[PDB]
């Protein structure tokens, strides 16, 4: 007997489309900034002359 039987899957292969890469790695842009504000402040005179 043939030692690899017919009981076994013989599914024939297909036209699979071409392979895309795993990762894009497109270029980044820096995020924007404005400068930090002082939190403790200068104050005016509460009392006049």
């Amino acid at each position: 007997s043939p030692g690899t039987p017919g009981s076994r899957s013989r599914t024939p292969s297909l036209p699979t489309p071409p392979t895309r890469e795993p990762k894009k790695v497109a270029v980044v842009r820096t995020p924007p900034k404005s400068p930090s504000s002082a939190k403790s402040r200068l104050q005016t005179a509460p009392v006049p002359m």
């Binding site: 007997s1 030692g3 690899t4 039987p5 392979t19 890469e21 795993p22 990762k23 790695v25």
Partner: protein, 111 residues
């Protein structure tokens, strides 16, 4: 450290210990070992080859079929013992690698 090549590298760390507090009869301490090496592939590669050395010539085969067997039963079982050698071949000399094969970022410089 002394034997690093004789581990499989995709099984990083390979040892399982147990310690019983009691010796056997005799000396103060002993230790039982159980190994699983692909080395045993050289047990199956022998018997399949000596099976092949009987099977074509069919020698003795009439006593096996005589008690009940078909030739297909021998032919799936030697083929089994070939498939098991190919399992050790899959699992010998393979490396530490990721989940599946993957493609790296190339050279594309043309401009």
């Amino acid at each position: 450290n002394k034997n690093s090549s004789y581990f499989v590298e995709w099984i990083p760390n390979n040892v399982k210990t147990a310690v019983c507090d009691i010796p056997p009869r005799g000396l103060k301490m002993s230790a039982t070992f159980i190994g699983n090496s692909t080395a045993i592939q050289e047990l199956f590669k022998r018997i399949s080859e000596q099976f092949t050395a009987m099977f074509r010539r069919k020698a003795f085969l009439h006593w096996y079929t005589g008690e009940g067997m078909d030739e297909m039963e021998f032919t799936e079982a030697e083929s089994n013992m070939n498939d098991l050698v190919s399992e050790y071949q899959q699992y010998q000399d393979a490396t530490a690698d990721e989940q599946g094969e993957f493609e790296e970022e190339g050279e594309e410089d043309e401009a």
